[model samples]
Target: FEPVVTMEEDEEVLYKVRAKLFRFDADAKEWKERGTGDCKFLKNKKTNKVRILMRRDKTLKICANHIIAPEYTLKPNVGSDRSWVYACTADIAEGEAEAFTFAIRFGSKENADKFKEEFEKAQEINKK
Candidate 1:
């Protein structure tokens, strides 16, 4: 959300970025902005799998293999010249509004493309 991360010197972090997490309230039947926080892209070395870790009021870890129907959108970056925004959606857990969204800014189009490829790979892994 806010891109707040405290990494160890030898930590092997995949991607550390700012993100905004909005939790859908089933009772309200609407999405509420849950503010911004640090988002960490992680990998499980044993399985060679990827997942996401969002630091909010607590840590929320969503495995890439657990995502359902992951989709992506490429858009212009209103704030940065070299950066572009990529928004994606996926259902990680059971809920009324099953879909969750993530907004990430890549420094370049190439970087975003790479992420898309990896995302697809994750999807495939989950499918099997």
Candidate 2:
């Protein structure tokens, strides 16, 4: 039998890891929770294009969806070793594509490193 759902039918999954996501609130001047779920690196199999897509666990709502740019850098957020923050020039997950600053936090140092490993790799793939 065929699978029940095929959301990303045209893409191949490059990497995936569990993490919490947050967006900077400019007006309120604080971090706002976006969603906690599996942050995934998905690539278009046809074009070899790579992008990151993350969805909230509970309701299955998408939180982050954008291409991994060469200009982007994954770094520790503040003094936290388990979190990485980066700026997204455009996120098409919700509404029109616009810039959004997002932060991702893993459960452990090892996991964070693992995420960064692929994060940088995705940027390379998408850059070319």
Candidate 3:
């Protein structure tokens, strides 16, 4: 099971979430879990872009500009509960056209809604 983690920050605590990091093991043709760590979502005030920060070793930061067709979903589970998850294909400066499927899971539906709203607002800001 993945350990639940709360992002350590001061400004505004968005959500307390957790997930097992996974990477495609090409040789085995399977996704393997890397070390799990805290995840933080941020919106840049100056650039008006959203960012996903994965705190493992150094922060693995991915910006919204790299994401294509960002979509948000509230996934339902067996317990009559829903969780927030974002689905997006991102190109993170790799030579490939589409690097990988970037996704983040939120602990609560409220947090997911908050992120979706912030992301939409950020996209609008980018247009201006």
Candidate 4:
């Protein structure tokens, strides 16, 4: 079998961790499950663009993809200590660029904080 190229080959992963993700639907006014996988903060080797990528388990289907913009922050989700949510308009799914309120639950509260710290870092550095 030939080797698989995800186009992520040329990128550098700044952070990778486990998550079960979801997205909000305005019309339905509810959260829709996107499945679970290891999510990552990937930095392009060339342009230094930073974005988040997550694939669903088993199928490795892409569940989320979007740039880490400076205007966004990782706010904790209500009624959950192990989850964080953020608002964004670009899911790309980066060209679909649909509006979404993304949320992901981490394995621990510590992991949630760790991801936010890197999320904050990516926002500032990805400005270039």
What TM-score would you give candidate 2 relative to the actual structure?
A: 0.90
Evaluated at residue 1, the lDDT of candidate 3 is: 88
What digit string (tens of lDDT, one per residue) describes model 2 on residues 1-128? Answer: 89989369999888989999989889998988888999989999888888888988878888888988889988677868999888899998786998988888889999999898898898889877
> Which stretches in model 3 have alpha-carbon errors above 4 Å?
1-38, 41-48, 57-89, 93-97
Count of steric clashes across candidates, in order: 5, 0, 0, 1
Model 3 collision count: 0
Task: Work out the TM-score per prediction.
Answer: 0.42, 0.90, 0.43, 0.89
Residue-level error in angstroms, candidate 1, position 33: 2.7
lDDT per residue, candidate 1, 31-126, as tens digits?
555445555555555554455555553554332212313344444445544333444354443333335443444455676566556556655554
- Give me candidate 1's TM-score against the actual structure: 0.42
**TM-score leader:** 2
Q: Candidate 1 — what's its lDDT?
A: 0.47
Over 22-43, each residue of candidate 4 has an lDDT whose tens digit, in order, gives 8878899888898799999999
Model 2 bad stretches (over 4 Å): 1-6
